[PDB]
Design a protein around this ligand. Structure first.
Ligand SMILES: [Zn+2]
Ligand SMILES: [Zn+2]
Ligand SMILES: [Zn+2]
Lengths: 224, 816, 77, 99, 111, 76, 128, 81
RNA sequence: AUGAUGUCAUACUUAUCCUGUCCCUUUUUUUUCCA
């Protein structure tokens, strides 16, 4: 479905070029999508974030409110992924400052290892034939490359809750989502867990139209 | 190529997967006739991977098993060469924690082996009984159970004889033994036609060297006993002895399952066997009463429950034999600390009580009411409560009852959780002491009262509760000083301001007044109720619930130790309980409006209800309009109908709708005595069915519904005809509530007026140009048809016959 | 419209109902079958016909149940 | 804030009762208090407050004062006859048109 | 006296183990009968045999010996004869002397 | 209590309305047997005063009104 | 379409007016519209218990002794917007005369509508 | 939403919130006949529950006399699942 | 002379709610002319 396999199960140039990456094929499809969408740098840094996320923001009990605040600062319209994008952007902007993350309630470990994974990604980028491009502030390309990677990882609104696009099994939004109260109609995620209730992490609001742009063979219109 | 084409046209499984139910009909029928030609050769390889595809859904599975079963019925022969494949790919489903995977694999394998070529099964699944893997042996064994479901044991039983008499492998003897136990699980009663054939099958392995086969065969004995209820050892005696000896000459897992089977046969047994067998096994039991092991404890205690619970275990036997070590080693803190042991120790100890009485068991668990792990004394009262509640307290002697009452008092004070445990324990224990409790009422109350004095709310509330429990026996032992006490002292505490205590106080006062009637209450209700009226303003759900309960009792029965003016003030206070957030309160309020209308006359309360109808915010209107209905029901409706009707003239909306809704409820409540006021009410409903608003016509329609169902059979059909004329035009409507009340009016009106009249109203618009009107008339005619489809046979029109059909019914116009 | 899943389940539930497109043929044939099932059920119209023609109750109900198959002509088209 | 309906109920109340009985007017209004009533009338609904365009001499005087007495808008406003919020917005507006 | 609600035909099993109730189209049920402990009869919930587009000219219990009881109905199928605009399928349709069978172990009725 | 305060706020508002339509002498007014308001001109039904006043601040009230005057001076 | 007009309140049945409820209710209405909030709550706390009375057998005789069949419409005559507006006329059986007809034609009203041949029966006798 | 898989001989029950109303008609009065449910909405954790609340089966769901006059009580387990 | 369009607040309906809700374990992936 992602396009690494032919209809008989062998390797496309897509499949190999993604396979050289020591990172999941969904991510790999998104990185290839940066090629089409000319959002190279931004999709790169996003990948760098999802590599390690699980520990980004320190959330201490003894400084909950100032913490929620140095977090709520960056909260961008569009979703957690471009949130991470701006966060990294601002950190390196500060000159890879540790006190920066110390002031802004971010785990320096996560940030700097993510930077390293992006830099070696760039060191892979010549082989995977990617042109170093910026989206020029056009987050539409960004969300669309996110789709071209993570179309599978989607849910839609149901009046009985947020529910999958395919299996129509019932999910919920993580409390700490930058969209957690926004609650969008057409949803993309990155995790699929079921903690105390079914959950999904690193979620974003999408267009169902990009879905017929990208995967009319996997996502047909009548199902949206 | 024709084969790839046949699959191409065969994928109208899309016609069946997607589509209309028309699509389903076209494809289902065509394939159910094309099944032989299209064959399961190509089908099965298309078919298995979808039935195994991870997210084929409930009804996809349902439809595809529809397909497999009917195409296998069709192609009894034309499914032949794919048997082992279907078999092994579906096999894990019968042994599977999805009951419906078990069911659906079961059903399709039934039909598969059913229309199948027979020998095939045997041929494929002989060499797998000898196999090396217990995994595959269990899978094929429970398969064989399903295949016996599909065909029948008889055709197979000698091959079972083989797979169980094998001298090559113990693997295969174990396999046959579990095949045995598996059918014994599945078909259940269906075994008695054999009933010993399988016993023969199994006699070989309870003596066997492999503990696996030995002990699964013990469990086979268990399962066969289970499906083979009290009909005893006319079959099972053929193996009773290896069980008997291994029980002692064994240790461990065999002890477990072999004890399980023997205790499953201990019901089916008889005296000269169920005396020797039990009496023998009891000494095993006494050595196992100290067994640390959990499933040990389960099996041995279940055993004991049935075993020392027969008629051939003497009272004396148990009391001198089982009880001392049983009580010693299970009445340690460990068992109540345990999550399983609490309840199951209960089970068997209550049963031993059922066996041998209370004057020893009660005595053996008295002082466990004063142990440490509050869970423990909690358990002991759980038991005692169950016990005396089922049995009665006849034989409980003096000193026993003393230590019991005292451990009771302790448990209840010591209480440290908000639980009904100790409450119910107390209630039951005195409920059974009956009249035995006379001399400790100073003790019991003095305790409760000192608690009622405490600093923290919770214990105060508890003591109020406990009073509300023992309230009845408090009197029934003639507690002049003491029940008088509780009366006046609670009249004291009526001044609390912790809602949680005030509510319980009201509860306890109510539960005293229930036993002791009004005219000997210790505070005369002549001073009680005046004290209660300023509490009705306490804006809290629990105290409000209990207060309105108490005032409702009083206004029902007392009602004359109070003055009209008091009742009027209390009316004015009830008028704003109709906004509580809890519905029990509001229903209680309406009931007491009824009682007050009975005590005082109806007219003043009705005047105070109309003025409330003038309020906004509909919750109050709905309740008051209910209350008006209730007043009218008790004090006959002619007293209130003129005032309601006349109030239908005040030009405001909420009130005209209040009048209409109240008549709705009224005709519901009175019922068959509407044959009087139907005439009075019609010109008001026709008035409000000629428009005034949506809600106006919605409500007049509800009124028509209930009038019709009340006046069924009393001849007031001209009036309901007249109102049909006015209701039927609303048939084209859109608002859900409006059209819905209309449809309801037409079902009521259908029983009350008959189905001719309504089929005639529904005639002309069945075949109308439009589609909105066609659809409403077919909705109605559907509901007219479902109910009373059989009258209509004499109500259908005369519909002439054209050229190539016959349409007249000559049956009906034979002359005679 | 899940109401409709239930409602054409109702059409599947009660043989003889209708919908806004139903044809004179389905309508009148369903009423004709129902007429037959009740002539059989009610023990007395059976005597009426048995006596009207000179047949006997076995004869009567056999005719009726034969007729139950194509009572009102052949189908529509 | 304030909505056409309430503004007109205010207008009616005031024009009846008079312009110093703020507590009863407040009582007519659901969820409005006399502080807000008085403020609303004296800034936006009073008809001696003019919503027109600035004479050139008004404006030149405006800038003259805002240089004489910088940031004292309540003191400046009455010397030219608009409310201080009007004066303030128009002064920033002239500053920015010449920005 | 409806058409698809059971009651017109009713048969038993010769030994007295189950009853079947049946309509003249689409519906038949079966009831199981067991003496209680005190031998005062009980009757559990009913089974099902809903099969569309099918008459019944009779239903009767077949005499088996302590097997699953089972019943012989006639049948017919007006279905096609109402799909054929020619009246051919009116003729050329055949009664189908059929047996349904209990399965008291698995508690259902199998064709 | 707030419910009675609300009921009488309502009633006072209604008298305010009757006063203004008195001081503005309206022949295009009705209070119907359900306690709403009408425009006998535009056949508009209103719950409350504020809405009635906004109605009579003619936009479609104005159109139908000027049409009424035009056809009146037409026929007479 | 009924939206536009003004409409007069519902008109009770005679046998219910007769029992004189309406005047009781009018009086109570005017009382409680005049009374002021403070006095309202004062009467809430000290009720005017049994201000009024109206006797039974007046009611029970209305509802059980003078209750009478209203005018009903037989099968078929659905009410539509303006159905009620149609008024009983089309009295084609000659003899059909009205009292205003008699007055504004010169003939008599009442028991003399028989013994009064109308001015058209004059030329009926004259030329047919 | 309805179960409606056909009736049986197993009585239904009411939580105490839901105590008193009919199952569909939503009445509070004159109940005549007892409710019966299907085996499938009878089994297991659904034994003795509130057809409406889902709460514990304590009081008996009943049928308003109107519902029995119109025989809306002859359809089977009406459980809102 | 009644259109849909509406980010209109108010009024209103269901004896419709006030009891159907909440925070991740562990950890790894080769790299390329410098200028
Ligand atoms: Zn109901
Ligand atoms: Zn069910
Ligand atoms: Zn409930």
């Amino acid at each position: 479905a992602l396009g690494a396999l032919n209809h008989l199960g062998e390797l496309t140039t897509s499949g190999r070029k993604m396979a050289e990456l020591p990172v999941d094929p969904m991510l790999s499809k998104m990185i290839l999508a940066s090629e089409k969408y000319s959002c190279s740098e931004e999709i790169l840094t996003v990948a760098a974030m999802l590599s390690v996320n699980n520990s980004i923001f320190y959330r201490p009990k003894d400084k909950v409110v100032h913490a929620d605040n140095a977090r709520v600062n960056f909260f961008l319209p569009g979703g957690d992924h471009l949130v991470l994008l701006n966060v990294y952007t601002q950190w390196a902007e500060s000159g890879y400052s540790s006190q920066w993350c110390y002031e802004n309630f971010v785990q320096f470990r996560s940030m700097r290892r993510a930077r390293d994974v992006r830099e070696q990604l760039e060191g892979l980028l010549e082989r995977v034939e990617v042109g170093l491009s910026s989206c020029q502030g056009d987050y539409i390309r960004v969300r669309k490359a996110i789709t071209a990677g993570y179309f599978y990882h989607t849910a839609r609104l149901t009046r009985s809750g947020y529910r999958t696009v395919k299996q129509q099994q019932t999910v919920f939004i993580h409390p700490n989502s930058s969209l957690f109260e926004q609650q969008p109609r057409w949803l993309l995620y990155h995790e699929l867990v079921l903690t105390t209730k079914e959950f999904m992490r690193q979620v974003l609001e999408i267009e169902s139209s990009w879905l017929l742009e990208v995967a009319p063979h996997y996502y047909k219109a009548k199902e949206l | 190529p024709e084969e790839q084409k046949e699959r191409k046209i065969m994928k109208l499984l899309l016609k069946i997967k997607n589509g209309t139910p028309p699509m389903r009909k076209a494809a289902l029928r065509q394939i159910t006739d094309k099944a032989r030609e299209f064959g399961a050769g190509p089908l099965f390889n298309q078919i298995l991977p979808l039935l195994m595809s991870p997210t084929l859904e409930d009804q996809e599975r349902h439809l595809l098993v529809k397909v497999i079963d009917r195409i296998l019925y069709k192609l009894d022969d034309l499914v032949r060469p794919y048997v082992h494949k279907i078999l092994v790919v579906i096999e894990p489903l019968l042994i599977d924690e999805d009951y419906y995977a078990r069911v659906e694999g079961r059903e399709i394998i039934s039909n598969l082996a059913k229309a199948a070529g027979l020998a095939t099964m045997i041929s494929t699944m002989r060499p797998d009984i000898d196999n090396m893997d217990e995994y595959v042996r269990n899978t094929t064994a429970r398969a064989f159970a399903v295949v016996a479901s599909a065909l029948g044991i008889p055709s197979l039983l000698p091959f079972l004889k083989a797979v169980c008499k094998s001298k090559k492998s113990w693997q295969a003897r174990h396999t046959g033994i579990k095949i045995v136990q598996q059918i014994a699980i599945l078909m259940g009663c269906a075994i008695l036609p054999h009933l010993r054939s399988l016993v023969e099958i199994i006699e070989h392995g309870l003596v066997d060297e492999q503990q696996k086969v030995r002990t699964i065969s013990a469990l086979a004995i268990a399962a066969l006993a289970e499906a083979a209820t009290p009909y005893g050892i006319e079959s099972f005696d053929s193996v009773l002895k290896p069980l008997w000896k291994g029980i002692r000459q064994h240790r461990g897992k065999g002890l477990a399952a072999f004890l399980k089977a023997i205790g499953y046969l201990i019901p089916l047994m008889d005296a000269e066997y169920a005396n020797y067998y039990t009496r023998e096994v009891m000494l095993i039991l006494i050595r196992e009463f100290q067994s640390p092991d959990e499933e040990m404890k389960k099996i041995v205690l279940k055993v004991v429950k049935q075993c020392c619970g027969t008629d051939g275990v003497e009272a004396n036997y148990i009391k001198t034999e089982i009880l001392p070590p049983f009580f010693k080693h299970f009445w340690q803190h460990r068992m109540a600390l345990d999550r399983r042991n609490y309840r199951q120790l209960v089970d068997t100890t209550v049963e031993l009580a059922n066996k041998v009485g209370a004057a020893e068991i009660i005595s053996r668990i008295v002082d466990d009411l004063k142990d440490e792990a509050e869970q423990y004394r909690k358990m002991v009262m759980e038991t005692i409560e169950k016990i005396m509640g089922n049995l009665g307290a006849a034989d409980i002697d003096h000193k026993l009852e003393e230590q019991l009452i005292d451990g009771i008092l302790y448990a209840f004070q010591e209480q440290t959780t908000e639980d009904s445990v100790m409450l119910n324990g107390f209630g039951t224990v005195v409920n059974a002491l009956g009249k035995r409790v006379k001399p400790y009422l100073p003790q019991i109350c003095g305790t409760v009262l000192w608690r009622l004095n405490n600093k923290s709310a919770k214990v105060r509330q508890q003591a109020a509760d406990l009073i509300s429990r023992t309230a009845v026996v408090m009197k029934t032992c003639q507690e002049e000083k003491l029940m008088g006490h509780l009366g006046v002292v609670l009249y004291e505490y009526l001044g609390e301001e912790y809602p949680e205590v005030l509510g319980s106080i009201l509860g306890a006062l109510k539960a005293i007044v229930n036993v002791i009637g009004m005219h000997k209450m210790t505070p005369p209700i002549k001073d009680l109720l005046p004290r209660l009226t300023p509490i009705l303003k306490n804006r809290h759900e629990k105290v409000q619930e209990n207060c309105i309960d108490l005032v409702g009792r009083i206004a029902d029965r007392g009602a004359e130790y109070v003055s009209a003016r008091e009742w009027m003030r209390i009316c004015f206070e009830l008028l704003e309980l109709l906004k509580a957030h809890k519905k029990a309160i509001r229903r209680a309020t309406v009931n007491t409006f009824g009682y007050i209308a009975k005590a005082i006359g109806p007219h003043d309360v009705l005047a105070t209800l109309l003025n409330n109808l003038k309020v906004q915010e509909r919750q109050n209107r709905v309740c008051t309009t209910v209350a008006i209905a209730i007043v009218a029901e008790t004090c006959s409706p002619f007293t209130v109908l003129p005032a309601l009707m006349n109030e239908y003239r005040v030009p405001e909306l909420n009130v005209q709708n209040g009048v209409l809704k109240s008549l709705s409820f009224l005709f519901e409540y009175i019922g068959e005595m509407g044959k009087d006021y139907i005439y009075a009410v019609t010109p008001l409903l026709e008035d409000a069915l000629m428009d005034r608003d949506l809600v106006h016509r919605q409500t007049a329609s509800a009124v028509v519904q209930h009038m019709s169902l009340g006046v069924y059979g009393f001849g007031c059909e001209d009036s309901l005809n007249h109102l049909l004329n006015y209701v039927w035009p609303n048939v084209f409507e859109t608002s859900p509530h409006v059209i819905q009340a209309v449809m309801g009016a037409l079902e009521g009106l259908r029983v009350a007026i008959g189905p001719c009249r309504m089929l005639q109203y529904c005639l002309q618009g069945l075949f109308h140009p439009a589609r909105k009107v066609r659809d409403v008339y077919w909705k109605i005619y559907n509901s007219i048809y479902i109910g009373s489809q059989d009258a209509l046979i004499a109500h259908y029109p005369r519909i002439y016959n054209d050229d190539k059909n016959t349409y007249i019914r000559y049956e009906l116009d034979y002359i005679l | 419209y899940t109401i409709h899943s239930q409602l054409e389940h109702l059409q599947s539930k009660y043989i003889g109902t209708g919908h806004a497109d139903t044809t004179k043929w389905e309508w009148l044939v369903n009423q004709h079958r129902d007429s037959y099932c009740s002539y059989m059920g009610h023990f007395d119209l059976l005597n009426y016909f048995a006596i009207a023609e000179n047949e006997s109750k076995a004869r009567v109900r056999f005719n009726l149940m034969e007729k139950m198959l194509q009572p009102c002509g052949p189908p529509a088209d | 804030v304030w909505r056409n309906t309430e503004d007109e109920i205010l207008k009616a109340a005031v024009m009846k009762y008079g312009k110093n009985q703020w507590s009863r007017i407040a009582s007519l209004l659901h969820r409005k208090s006399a502080k807000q009533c008085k403020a609303r009338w004296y800034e936006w609904l009073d008809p001696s407050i003019k919503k027109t365009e600035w004479s050139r001499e008004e404006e030149e005087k405006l800038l003259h004062l805002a240089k004489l007495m910088p940031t004292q808008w309540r003191t400046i406003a009455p010397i030219i006859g608009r409310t201080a919020a009007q004066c303030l917005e128009h002064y920033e507006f002239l500053l920015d048109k010449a920005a | 006296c409806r058409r698809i609600v059971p009651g017109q035909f009713l048969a038993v099993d010769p030994k007295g183990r189950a009853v079947m109730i049946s309509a003249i189209e689409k519906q038949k049920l079966v009831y199981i009968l067991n003496r209680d402990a005190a031998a005062r009869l009980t009757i559990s919930s009913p089974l099902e045999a809903h099969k569309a587009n099918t008459l019944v000219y009779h239903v009767v219990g077949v005499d088996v010996g302590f097997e699953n009881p089972m019943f012989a109905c006639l049948e017919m199928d007006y279905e096609e004869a109402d799909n054929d605009p020619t009246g051919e399928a009116a003729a050329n349709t055949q009664q189908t002397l059929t047996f349904y069978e209990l399965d008291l172990g698995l508690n259902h009725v199998v064709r | 209590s707030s419910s009675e305060s609300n009921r009488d706020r309502r009633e006072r508002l209604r008298q305010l309305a009757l006063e203004t339509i008195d001081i503005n002498k309206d022949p295009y007014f009705m209070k119907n047997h359900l306690g709403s308001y009408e425009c006998k001109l535009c056949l508009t039904l209103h719950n409350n005063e504020g809405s009635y006043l906004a109605h009579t601040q003619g936009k479609k009230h104005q159109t139908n009104l000027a049409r009424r005057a035009a056809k009146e001076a037409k026929e007479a | 379409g009924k939206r536009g007009i003004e409409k007069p309140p519902f008109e009770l049945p005679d046998f219910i007016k007769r029992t004189g409820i309406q005047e009781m209710r009018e009086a109570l209405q005017e009382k409680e519209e005049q009374k002021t909030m403070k006095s309202k709550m004062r009467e809430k706390v000290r009720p005017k218990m049994g201000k009024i009375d109206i006797d039974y057998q007046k009611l029970h005789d209305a509802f059980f002794k003078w209750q009478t069949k209203p005018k009903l419409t037989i099968h078929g005559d659905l009410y539509y917007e303006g159905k009620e507006f149609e008024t009983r006329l089309k009295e084609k059986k000659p003899g059909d005369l009205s009292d205003e007809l008699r007055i504004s034609l010169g003939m008599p009203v009442g028991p003399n509508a028989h013994k009064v041949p109308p001015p058209w029966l004059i030329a009926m006798q004259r030329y047919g | 939403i309805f179960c409606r898989k056909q009736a049986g001989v197993a009585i239904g029950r009411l939580c105490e919130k839901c105590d008193g109303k009919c199952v569909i008609c939503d009445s509070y009065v004159r109940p005549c006949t007892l409710v019966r449910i299907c085996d499938e909405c009878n089994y297991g954790s659904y034994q003795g529950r509130c057809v409406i609340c889902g709460g514990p089966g304590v009081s008996d769901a009943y049928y308003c006399k109107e519902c029995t006059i119109q025989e809306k009580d002859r359809d089977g387990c009406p459980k809102i699942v």
